[PDB]
């Protein structure tokens, strides 16, 4: 990945200027890497992926058509209620990494 | 190297909390490394290892024997101004690097 410092400029600035929810790493670090597993992967999206969070959007399709072909495929979901939002707040910070360059 | 924090600890504080010359790395970078050299070793020694900074300590062995077999071998060293030793000043702050968990 170091190959690209751009991304890991803004990377390093969510990460040391938030705090919690949008501090979150977007890439994986090396120990959860290792940790992660299908059953993980499984039980997150089953908690995550409700109705109240699909959208189905279309650049070119007619409404009736996608409409019929997408509701039967989609009306059987659960109505589980919008969890709430993760909030976080934002602090200074101030991240430097040495390295080859 | 990171087998052993304490080490790391005390050269990431020199480097940190010095300025020029005692800021100077004792473990040798990776590019100082690639950069190294047999001439270079040679013209540092032949520069530094002279007379006037030279001390031969003998811990149980009488003065007079050190002294007539160390003479007839160090004697012809060359007499050289001894060059000043460097500045440094201390004003520093932080250090900090992201390694295991």
Redesign the interface.
């Known amino acids: 990945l170091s190959n690209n410092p751009q991304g890991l400029l803004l990377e390093a600035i969510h990460s040391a200027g938030y705090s919690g929810a949008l501090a979150y790493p977007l890439l994986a670090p090396e120990?959860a890497l290792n940790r992660l597993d299908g059953p993980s992967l499984e039980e997150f999206v089953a908690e995550n992926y409700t109705a109240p969070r699909m959208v189905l959007a279309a650049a070119g399709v007619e409404h009736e058509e996608l409409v019929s072909i997408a509701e039967p495929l989609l009306s059987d979901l659960p109505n589980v209620p919008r969890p709430d939002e993760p909030k976080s707040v934002y602090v200074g910070g101030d991240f430097?990494?040495?390295g080859?360059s």
Do not use: Q
């Open positions: 120990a430097r990494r040495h080859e």
